[PDB]
Tab-separated table of C-alpha atoms in Angstrom:
chain	number	residue	atom	x	y	z
A	1	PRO	CA	105.956	-113.737	82.130
A	2	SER	CA	106.624	-113.816	78.353
A	3	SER	CA	108.613	-110.577	78.324
A	4	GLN	CA	111.043	-111.741	81.079
A	5	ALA	CA	111.285	-115.194	79.490
A	6	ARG	CA	112.401	-113.582	76.239
A	7	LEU	CA	114.947	-111.457	77.961
A	8	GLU	CA	116.450	-114.489	79.861
A	9	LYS	CA	116.509	-116.683	76.784
A	10	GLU	CA	118.332	-113.990	74.797
A	11	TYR	CA	120.825	-113.570	77.613
A	12	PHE	CA	121.536	-117.346	78.062
A	13	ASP	CA	121.808	-117.952	74.342
A	14	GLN	CA	124.305	-115.250	73.920
A	15	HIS	CA	126.486	-115.704	77.013
A	16	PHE	CA	126.216	-119.552	77.520
A	17	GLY	CA	124.941	-121.425	74.463
A	18	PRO	CA	125.452	-123.119	72.156
A	19	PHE	CA	128.073	-125.158	74.130
A	20	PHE	CA	126.132	-124.859	77.417
A	21	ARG	CA	122.735	-125.771	78.570
A	22	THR	CA	121.240	-123.948	81.623
A	23	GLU	CA	120.186	-125.411	84.895
A	24	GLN	CA	117.559	-123.108	86.605
A	25	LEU	CA	115.718	-123.130	89.821
A	26	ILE	CA	112.835	-120.957	90.972
A	27	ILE	CA	112.762	-120.319	94.645
A	28	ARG	CA	109.827	-118.809	96.586
A	29	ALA	CA	109.225	-118.166	100.276
A	30	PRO	CA	105.390	-118.529	100.369
A	31	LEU	CA	105.207	-118.445	104.170
A	32	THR	CA	107.198	-115.264	104.518
A	33	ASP	CA	105.661	-111.803	104.659
A	34	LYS	CA	106.767	-108.925	102.424
A	35	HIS	CA	108.391	-106.190	104.567
A	36	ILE	CA	109.113	-102.505	104.570
A	37	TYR	CA	112.542	-100.817	104.602
A	38	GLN	CA	112.708	-97.359	106.134
A	39	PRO	CA	115.887	-95.445	104.993
A	40	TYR	CA	118.119	-93.658	107.417
A	41	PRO	CA	117.752	-90.881	108.467
A	42	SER	CA	114.476	-90.320	106.474
A	43	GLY	CA	112.896	-91.197	103.247
A	44	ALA	CA	109.787	-92.907	101.866
A	45	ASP	CA	109.214	-96.546	102.869
A	46	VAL	CA	110.599	-99.060	100.369
A	47	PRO	CA	108.627	-102.341	100.106
A	48	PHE	CA	110.621	-105.574	99.900
A	49	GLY	CA	109.149	-108.819	98.493
A	50	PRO	CA	109.058	-111.981	100.668
A	51	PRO	CA	112.239	-113.738	99.581
A	52	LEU	CA	114.398	-110.582	99.956
A	53	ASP	CA	114.127	-111.102	103.687
A	54	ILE	CA	117.638	-111.347	105.181
A	55	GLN	CA	117.139	-114.829	106.732
A	56	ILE	CA	115.740	-116.115	103.391
A	57	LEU	CA	118.731	-114.723	101.568
A	58	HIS	CA	121.192	-116.538	103.807
A	59	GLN	CA	119.114	-119.763	103.392
A	60	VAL	CA	119.272	-119.319	99.562
A	61	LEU	CA	123.003	-118.751	99.681
A	62	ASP	CA	123.342	-121.983	101.529
A	63	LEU	CA	121.345	-123.728	98.873
A	64	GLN	CA	123.553	-122.194	96.135
A	65	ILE	CA	126.793	-123.288	97.977
A	66	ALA	CA	125.319	-126.803	98.503
A	67	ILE	CA	124.623	-127.053	94.720
A	68	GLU	CA	128.189	-126.075	93.886
A	69	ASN	CA	129.474	-128.876	96.002
A	70	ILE	CA	127.354	-131.653	94.625
A	71	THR	CA	129.411	-134.620	93.235
A	72	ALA	CA	128.298	-137.653	91.384
A	73	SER	CA	129.758	-141.143	90.954
A	74	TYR	CA	130.314	-142.344	87.436
A	75	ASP	CA	132.336	-145.516	86.575
A	76	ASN	CA	133.862	-145.379	90.028
A	77	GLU	CA	135.047	-141.930	89.424
A	78	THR	CA	133.966	-138.601	91.068
A	79	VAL	CA	132.336	-135.981	88.874
A	80	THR	CA	132.221	-132.398	90.171
A	81	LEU	CA	130.374	-129.313	89.009
A	82	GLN	CA	133.847	-127.716	88.319
A	83	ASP	CA	134.311	-130.513	85.766
A	84	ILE	CA	131.306	-129.426	83.729
A	85	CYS	CA	130.652	-125.834	84.638
A	86	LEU	CA	131.565	-122.516	82.793
A	87	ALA	CA	134.732	-121.363	84.585
A	88	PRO	CA	136.108	-118.294	82.637
A	89	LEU	CA	139.150	-117.664	84.846
A	90	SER	CA	140.489	-121.253	85.025
A	91	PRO	CA	143.057	-122.519	85.899
A	92	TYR	CA	143.670	-119.422	88.093
A	93	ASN	CA	140.234	-119.221	89.540
A	94	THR	CA	138.233	-122.538	89.053
A	95	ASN	CA	134.920	-121.070	90.369
A	96	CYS	CA	131.833	-121.789	88.334
A	97	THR	CA	129.398	-119.343	86.791
A	98	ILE	CA	126.326	-119.262	88.868
A	99	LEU	CA	123.726	-116.501	88.797
A	100	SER	CA	121.596	-115.349	91.739
A	101	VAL	CA	120.768	-112.243	93.776
A	102	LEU	CA	123.514	-113.299	96.149
A	103	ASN	CA	125.924	-112.240	93.345
A	104	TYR	CA	125.445	-108.654	94.481
A	105	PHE	CA	126.873	-109.627	97.897
A	106	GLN	CA	129.979	-111.482	96.685
A	107	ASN	CA	128.069	-114.813	97.391
A	108	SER	CA	129.109	-114.259	101.009
A	109	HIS	CA	127.234	-114.606	104.309
A	110	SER	CA	129.400	-111.930	106.002
A	111	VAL	CA	129.139	-109.487	102.995
A	112	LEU	CA	125.374	-109.971	103.023
A	113	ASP	CA	125.406	-108.831	106.689
A	114	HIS	CA	127.567	-105.744	106.002
A	115	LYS	CA	126.359	-102.653	107.841
A	116	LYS	CA	127.359	-99.337	109.317
A	117	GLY	CA	125.773	-97.137	112.004
A	118	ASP	CA	125.907	-96.341	115.729
A	119	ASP	CA	124.334	-98.029	118.875
A	120	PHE	CA	120.807	-96.856	117.886
A	121	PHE	CA	120.562	-96.715	114.103
A	122	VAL	CA	121.809	-98.740	111.172
A	123	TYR	CA	122.655	-96.153	108.447
A	124	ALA	CA	123.084	-98.652	105.529
A	125	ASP	CA	122.849	-102.393	105.090
A	126	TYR	CA	121.867	-105.056	102.512
A	127	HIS	CA	118.639	-103.207	101.656
A	128	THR	CA	120.472	-100.082	100.351
A	129	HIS	CA	123.110	-102.191	98.538
A	130	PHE	CA	120.237	-104.156	96.833
A	131	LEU	CA	118.432	-101.082	95.735
A	132	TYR	CA	121.693	-99.653	94.358
A	133	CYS	CA	122.797	-102.821	92.673
A	134	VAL	CA	119.456	-103.524	90.783
A	135	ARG	CA	119.798	-99.966	89.239
A	136	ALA	CA	123.590	-100.273	88.584
A	137	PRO	CA	124.507	-104.017	88.299
A	138	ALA	CA	127.945	-103.251	86.712
A	139	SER	CA	129.136	-101.037	89.560
A	140	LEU	CA	132.260	-102.082	91.498
A	141	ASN	CA	131.788	-99.472	94.197
A	142	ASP	CA	128.743	-98.818	96.408
A	143	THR	CA	129.891	-95.641	98.241
A	144	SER	CA	126.898	-95.750	100.549
A	145	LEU	CA	127.974	-99.163	101.890
A	146	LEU	CA	131.707	-99.593	102.468
A	147	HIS	CA	132.558	-99.410	98.755
A	148	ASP	CA	131.110	-102.990	98.373
A	149	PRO	CA	130.923	-104.102	94.688
A	150	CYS	CA	127.795	-105.126	92.785
A	151	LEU	CA	129.663	-106.712	89.893
A	152	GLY	CA	131.454	-110.023	90.567
A	153	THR	CA	135.023	-111.072	89.948
A	154	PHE	CA	134.046	-112.471	86.507
A	155	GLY	CA	131.009	-112.799	84.213
A	156	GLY	CA	129.735	-109.304	83.686
A	157	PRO	CA	126.663	-107.409	85.114
A	158	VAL	CA	123.909	-109.586	86.676
A	159	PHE	CA	120.672	-107.964	85.562
A	160	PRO	CA	117.988	-108.180	88.153
A	161	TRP	CA	115.508	-109.760	85.694
A	162	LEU	CA	117.945	-112.749	85.602
A	163	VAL	CA	117.738	-113.366	89.284
A	164	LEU	CA	114.370	-112.006	90.467
A	165	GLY	CA	110.695	-112.815	89.518
A	166	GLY	CA	107.168	-111.929	90.259
A	167	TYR	CA	107.609	-108.236	90.749
A	168	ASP	CA	105.347	-105.616	89.322
A	169	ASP	CA	106.499	-103.468	86.384
A	170	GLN	CA	110.245	-103.002	87.074
A	171	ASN	CA	109.933	-102.669	90.814
A	172	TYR	CA	112.546	-105.347	91.486
A	173	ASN	CA	112.295	-104.842	95.302
A	174	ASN	CA	108.801	-106.386	95.060
A	175	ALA	CA	110.208	-109.702	93.832
A	176	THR	CA	108.156	-112.741	94.957
A	177	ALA	CA	110.647	-115.273	93.493
A	178	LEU	CA	114.391	-115.773	93.301
A	179	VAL	CA	116.045	-117.403	90.337
A	180	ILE	CA	119.324	-119.442	90.502
A	181	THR	CA	120.814	-120.199	87.062
A	182	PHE	CA	124.114	-121.934	86.114
A	183	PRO	CA	125.338	-123.299	82.849
A	184	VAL	CA	126.491	-126.863	82.398
A	185	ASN	CA	128.511	-128.018	79.361
A	186	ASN	CA	126.529	-129.984	76.726
A	187	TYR	CA	129.709	-131.736	75.456
A	188	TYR	CA	128.169	-132.111	72.070
A	189	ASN	CA	131.420	-133.428	70.727
A	190	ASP	CA	132.612	-135.759	73.579
A	191	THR	CA	130.411	-138.674	74.606
A	192	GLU	CA	132.537	-139.640	77.581
A	193	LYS	CA	132.237	-136.171	79.150
A	194	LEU	CA	128.601	-135.896	78.248
A	195	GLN	CA	127.884	-139.140	80.046
A	196	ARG	CA	129.665	-137.837	83.205
A	197	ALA	CA	127.831	-134.496	82.961
A	198	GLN	CA	124.572	-136.421	82.785
A	199	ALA	CA	125.522	-138.329	85.943
A	200	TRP	CA	125.995	-134.977	87.740
A	201	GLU	CA	122.734	-133.599	86.442
A	202	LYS	CA	120.846	-136.640	87.712
A	203	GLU	CA	122.321	-136.223	91.218
A	204	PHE	CA	121.473	-132.533	91.017
A	205	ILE	CA	117.873	-133.244	90.286
A	206	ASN	CA	117.699	-135.798	93.094
A	207	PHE	CA	119.429	-133.309	95.436
A	208	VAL	CA	116.755	-130.638	94.641
A	209	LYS	CA	113.881	-133.050	95.047
A	210	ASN	CA	115.139	-134.196	98.415
A	211	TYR	CA	116.107	-130.702	99.721
A	212	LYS	CA	114.485	-129.953	103.069
A	213	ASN	CA	113.698	-126.343	103.962
A	214	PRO	CA	110.176	-125.595	105.196
A	215	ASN	CA	110.690	-121.908	104.240
A	216	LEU	CA	111.477	-122.428	100.590
A	217	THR	CA	109.656	-123.993	97.717
A	218	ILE	CA	112.116	-124.901	94.943
A	219	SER	CA	110.963	-125.716	91.395
A	220	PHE	CA	112.641	-126.353	88.143
A	221	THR	CA	112.545	-124.217	84.924
């Protein structure tokens, strides 16, 4: 939509550009049904869009992690994402900036699966953490689920309209698409590094095009 596109462009221009371009993937799960979450112990049903299914989320996290570990050969050298990414905490923490709904779950399979309850009921899980985080992306403490943070170790709040698409109004839980975005240095003032970055981007494009997961359709822009 035009409104969301305007919001994203303003966010990327402020927080990444002019030194960084953005790589962006749109991920859908067209063969996955939407579902209904029923809060414990009672509460109105909360609809969740197709790609917010827990198995789809694990599969998208695997896609994200795979992307971070892509390398490219250039002049017999190995070029990594960490060479060309935005890494605010370097040299301490050399992790790259990469935005997705998995950011709300520390980009972790185990955290995504966090839950509490008894032998019969689950009291809280990723559903309630999601609903909380899309209303308070800057929170470092979800009291209803084990004090798990929404906000990541660096980068500032991840607004849901950066990482979700296809919902109605501002009902983010009805998202029909996931968005993965990460900045890559344009190296406007260094031809050698620019050529290496382009070698990485070319391998990324090829990676995406050859990615095999029957549950996901991945597209660019």
